[PDB]
Write a protein that binds this DNA or RNA. Structure first.
Ligand SMILES: [K+]
Ligand SMILES: [Mg+2]
Ligand SMILES: [Mg+2]
Ligand SMILES: [Zn+2]
Ligand SMILES: [Zn+2]
Ligand SMILES: [Zn+2]
Ligand SMILES: [Zn+2]
Lengths: 46, 97, 48, 113, 48, 255, 264, 49, 96
RNA sequence: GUUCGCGAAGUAACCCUUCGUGGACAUUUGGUCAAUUUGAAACAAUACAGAGAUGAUCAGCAGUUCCCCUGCAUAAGGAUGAACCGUUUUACAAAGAGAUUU
């Protein structure tokens, strides 16, 4: 299917983005790759 | 003006209003940044890297030192490590200045 | 319509653009109905 | 805000601080075009660089991160430091960065990480 | 009155012939070059 | 047939009810079309209007325009436009279910968009996840103006009114819970019948109560939950297996 | 920004479709977050307007069309798809959908396919599933009302009867199948069936219809080899004939069951 | 658009509230074209939603 | 509207005298117009001890209390009021 | 419909009136949206409770949060706006020594 994409002129007196709202989101922290941590090798003093 | 009002009516209010540093907030933000500065220095120099409870203990010593400075009472804690003592006195002198 | 969308039907707007409360308002009503300078500037220009 | 770095070729600055993000600003419009997310604690140093990785940043989370600013992703995460990486510097004549903890200064090749 | 809506123009106003406006009486001789047109809404707007 | 005649005008434009609802507060809100300043008194009322399928059905502009969706107000028995209506004025049938068979997954037979989750009330348009064919019929006491009636008599009334509105799988009345369950052949008839029978009375012209039928609250017609009866559950599992086996034929023949 | 995911059955068969894009024009039906709305008509003079109801990332997560939410390979609904796959896989998979709105927003942003989607989102797995599916297809007042019920009398030519009694109705049978088979026999009818009673009654419009009904083969009526038995019911019936409560209906069903087992 | 109680006016109500930011412009244009004392009835070209 | 508003809106048909007379007829049936006490905020005038649970209540503690005008008057002329608080630990009613 | 052209009848009138007929001119609106209860506005009322620090009363200013509200607002206010008060077991070892399984 060949699709002709248009974007019709919005009513300037209506809100420009009908679906737009202030809403909070918790984003998932997904990650497939594990990152190594790469360190090397009198307690009364502290 | 009216645009922002009507935008609030339809879109709602922004979730993430960042308050600026006005003179009503000046002292509190100074305290927060000073506290974080002392904590960064002490957690970096401590050999054992133990954090969770130690931080809340150390900053109480900081605040007590500040009270002693304002009272002109000599701040001296027996058994305080000498380097951490120096760090606390350093930040107390900067706040004092 | 702006008054009514905000639910402040206890405020009445005259046909000469005075805004008057229809009843003595609760403190929660006063806080909820505290319209700002944008609305009032608009209202008084319409009055003129 | 703890640091600012001026991009060597673009009309762009990078800034970071206790809010654990680097924000890139277009100088002219003052828009924060890009926010780089991934550090788990306050960022101490930011260095801008003429080629990818165009931002280098060091943090209290003990990492140095090398950024692709167009992807909004790290090229590499450097995890060899034990403490807060408080200090950093670019070498002016070779493609390298130095970074420091307590007792531990290291140097890194930016083409590879 | 505050409690009376604004009037419908077509019902109450459109049918009334207006009263005379403020026009100073111009001389047929000594104002002859302007008397025909001075009080138009756009004076000389049709004089090519 | 309904095809033999042009659709009747159910209600004249001047006879339509006012848009302002019954007062439940001190001030009418011109935005929300509802009363503010207090909330007292019930919002439910009996419908003045009821569909009469053999009398009111007929051809409309929608049949000529190739329309798919049915008229919401025809179902409510209060369509103003009659034969000039863009929407279909007849009870849904297998022809029109077939024509709706693509859109039906996400749309009502009235062309309203379905939701992810049902309302907590179980009212409204319904879920695109479930494909429910069963209506809960509550408020039966109010639908009879609190007239005492035997349970089989109530069942006979529910059997009469709902069977005008589509092909039916099952009707059961539960005396202890005082509620009925009507299951249709097609979801489109359940969608239609819900809006047709919502807020109606079950009373007859033959009843002594008929002249005050408007006073209470009408039928409360909602989507049914899943039947907890184990016989119904294993019947549901059997028809699920049968639907699956019938679908395997299509997938195999296509690939 | 990804392209819209719309199936051919939505788009139709016209060579060209005009489509209107609206950034942030709609809120997704699954996740409630804003998205770029697409809407189109199959032809210029079709009167129904089709729009994307779900966003592209919810659609790829489920492997479904944005406009009709059927599977974008197999063109079947999610429940039936996940059920089909779970007959071929021993370990069940189903599309777990969020109920809380914050979990709806959270779930939509993780880039991992859900339920039967990954098993259908590449041709190799989906073709393997259908290859295996071919193997599957290759493989207490009863003592009173029993005199109101016509059980003593028989199916006969002579008596003109407009009403009949049906029994041995299997609970699987819907009401519409019964009416439909009588309609087939009569070449075209008020029916009451109580499935907890496993019996019912049939009332015709006029006596010649009932006479034409009794003209075609106590009698029997067939529904998918369920043998509904039929008796002329001269005494008029109503819903009360089968019991006033659920327990009465069940007791009547057991009574009718033992009477059937005696008759057979 | 006198009462606007029916559901058909929802989009119109939204358009009304969005029009509110352009009122001072309309007020300027109206008062700017005010009839002067020597003219009875000024016909004016208008643009309307 | 602001705290110090000058005018309230009256409907055009509003007669104040008839309104007061109607509201007087209504007032005899409203619950909160006919309950026996008025709620007030007050400080504890002296140090006191609860008798149910022995809790000490210092002076100048703020409470939400109930005010009753009593039938009896001092020298048949001056109004006497009972002031009732409830104990902060055990919620028992204390009156003076 | 207007108009150019060609046939038939008025009017041997080739223009004007009528009829038959070829061509040109003009070319796809609108909807994210249907009209009362079942796709979701809020206050108010009623009953009961009740005011951050702590011996008591009060000015505040912050911070954390998948709570926001009023406000043109990155100002300010909303009780210091609210929520905060609870819950708390292992990176668990070494040396002995007494009852005891084996
Ligand atoms: K305070
Ligand atoms: Mg504040
Ligand atoms: Mg605060
Ligand atoms: Zn209609
Ligand atoms: Zn989505
Ligand atoms: Zn589709
Ligand atoms: Zn006590």
């Amino acid at each position: 299917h060949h699709i002709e994409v248009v974007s019709k002129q919005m009513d300037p007196l209506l809100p420009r983005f009908v679906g737009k709202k202030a809403r909070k989101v918790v984003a998932p922290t997904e990650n497939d790759e594990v990152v190594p941590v790469l360190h090397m090798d009198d307690p009364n003093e502290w | 003006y009216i645009g922002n009002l009507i935008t609030r009516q339809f879109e709602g209010r922004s979730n993430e209003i960042v308050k600026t540093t006005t003179k009503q907030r000046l002292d509190a933000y100074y305290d927060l940044e000073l506290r974080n500065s002392v904590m960064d220095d002490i957690l970096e120099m401590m050999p054992e890297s133990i954090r969770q409870k130690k931080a809340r203990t150390i900053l109480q010593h900081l605040s007590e030192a500040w009270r002693c400075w304002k009272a002109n009472i000599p701040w001296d804690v027996p058994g305080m490590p000498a380097p951490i003592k120096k760090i606390i006195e350093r930040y107390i002198k900067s706040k004092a200045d | 319509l702006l008054i009514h969308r905000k639910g402040l039907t206890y405020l009445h707007l005259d046909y000469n653009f005075n805004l008057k409360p229809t009843k003595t308002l609760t403190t929660k009503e006063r806080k909820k109905s505290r319209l700002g300078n944008s609305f009032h500037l608009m209202r008084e220009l319409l009055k003129m | 805000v703890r640091t600012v770095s001026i991009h060597p070729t673009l009309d762009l600055i990078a800034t970071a601080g206790r809010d654990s993000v680097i924000k890139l600003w277009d100088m002219r419009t003052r828009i924060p075009v890009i926010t780089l997310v991934g550090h788990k604690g306050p960022i101490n140093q930011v260095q801008c660089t003429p080629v990818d990785p165009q931002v280098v940043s060091s943090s209290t989370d003990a990492t140095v991160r090398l950024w692709d600013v167009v992807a909004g992703k790290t090229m590499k995460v450097l995890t060899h430091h034990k403490r807060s990486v408080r200090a950093t510097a670019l070498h002016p004549k070779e493609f390298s960065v130095a970074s420091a903890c307590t007792d531990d200064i290291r140097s890194w090749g930016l083409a590879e990480g | 009155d505050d409690d009376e809506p604004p009037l419908s123009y077509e019902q109450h106003i459109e049918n009334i012939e207006p009263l005379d406006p403020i026009n100073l009486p111009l001389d047929s001789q000594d104002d002859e070059y302007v008397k025909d047109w001075l009080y138009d809404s756009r004076p000389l707007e049709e004089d090519s | 047939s309904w095809r033999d005649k042009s659709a009747k005008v159910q209600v004249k434009e001047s006879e339509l009810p006012s848009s302002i609802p019954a007062q439940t507060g001190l001030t009418f809100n011109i935005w929300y079309n509802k009363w503010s300043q207090g909330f007292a008194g019930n919002t439910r009322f009996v419908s003045p209007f009821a569909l009469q399928p053999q009398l009111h059905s007929g051809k409309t502009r929608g049949d000529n325009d190739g329309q798919l969706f049915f008229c919401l107000f025809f179902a409510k028995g209060m369509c103003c436009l009659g034969p000039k209506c863009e929407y279909l004025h007849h009870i849904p049938d297998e022809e029109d279910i077939g024509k709706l068979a693509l859109r039906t997954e996400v749309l009502d037979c009235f062309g309203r968009e379905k939701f992810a989750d049902y309302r907590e009330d179980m009212g409204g348009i319904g879920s695109f996840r479930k494909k429910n064919k069963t209506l809960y019929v509550g408020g039966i006491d109010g639908a009879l103006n609190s007239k005492h009636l035997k349970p089989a008599q109530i069942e006979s009334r529910i059997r009469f009114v709902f069977s005008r509105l589509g092909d039916i799988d099952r009707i059961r009345y539960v005396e202890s819970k005082n509620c009925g369950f009507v299951k249709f052949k097609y979801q489109a008839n359940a969608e239609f019948a819900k809006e047709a029978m919502s807020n109606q009375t079950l009373l007859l012209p033959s009843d002594k109560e008929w002249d005050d039928r408007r006073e209470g609250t009408g039928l409360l017609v909602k989507w049914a939950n899943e039947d907890p009866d184990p016989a119904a559950q294993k019947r549901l599992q059997e028809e699920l297996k049968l639907e699956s086996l019938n679908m395997m034929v299509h997938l195999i023949n296509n690939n | 920004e990804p392209p819209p995911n719309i199936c051919e059955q939505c788009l139709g068969d016209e060579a060209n479709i005009r489509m209107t894009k609206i950034p942030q024009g709609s809120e997704c039906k699954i996740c409630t977050l804003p998205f770029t709305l697409y809407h189109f008509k199959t032809s210029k003079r079709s009167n129904n307007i089709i729009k994307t109801l779900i966003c592209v990332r919810c659609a790829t997560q489920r492997n479904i069309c944005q406009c009709c939410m059927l599977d974008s390979r197999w063109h079947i609904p999610i429940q039936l798809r996940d059920h089909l796959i779970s007959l071929v896989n021993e370990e069940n998979v189903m599309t777990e959908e969020a109920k809380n709105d914050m979990m709806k927003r959270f779930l939509s942003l993780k880039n991992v396919k859900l339920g039967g989607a990954q098993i259908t989102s590449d041709p190799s797995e989906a073709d393997n599933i259908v290859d295996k599916l071919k193997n599957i297809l290759l493989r207490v007042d009863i003592s009173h009302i029993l005199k109101k019920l016509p059980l003593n009398e028989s199916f006969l030519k002579n008596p003109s009867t407009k009403s009949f009694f049906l029994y041995n109705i299997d609970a699987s049978i819907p009401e519409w199948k019964i009416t439909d088979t009588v309609s087939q026999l009569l070449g075209i009818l008020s029916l009451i069936v109580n499935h907890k009673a496993k019996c019912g009654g049939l009332r015709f419009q006029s006596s010649e219809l009932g006479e034409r009904f009794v003209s075609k083969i106590r009698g029997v009526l067939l529904i998918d080899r369920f043998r509904i038995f039929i008796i002329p019911w001269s005494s008029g019936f109503s819903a009360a004939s089968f019991g006033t409560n659920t327990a009465e209906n069940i007791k009547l069903s057991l009574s009718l069951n033992k009477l059937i087992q005696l008759e057979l | 658009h006198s009462d606007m109680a029916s559901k058909m006016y929802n989009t119109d109500k939204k358009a009304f509230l969005g029009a509110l930011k352009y009122l001072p412009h309309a007020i300027l244009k109206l008062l700017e074209n005010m009839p002067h004392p020597w003219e009875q009835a000024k016909e004016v070209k208008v643009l309307y939603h | 509207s602001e705290r110090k508003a000058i005018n309230k809106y009256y409907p055009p048909d509003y007669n104040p005298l008839e309104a007061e007379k109607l509201s007087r007829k209504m007032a005899k049936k409203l619950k909160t117009m006919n309950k026996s006490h008025a709620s007030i905020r007050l400080m504890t005038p002296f140090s006191m001890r609860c008798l149910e649970c022995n809790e000490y209540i210092p002076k100048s503690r703020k409470f939400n209390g109930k005010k009753e005008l009593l039938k009896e008057k001092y020298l048949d002329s001056i109004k006497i009021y009972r002031l009732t608080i409830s104990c902060p630990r055990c919620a028992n009613s204390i009156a003076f």
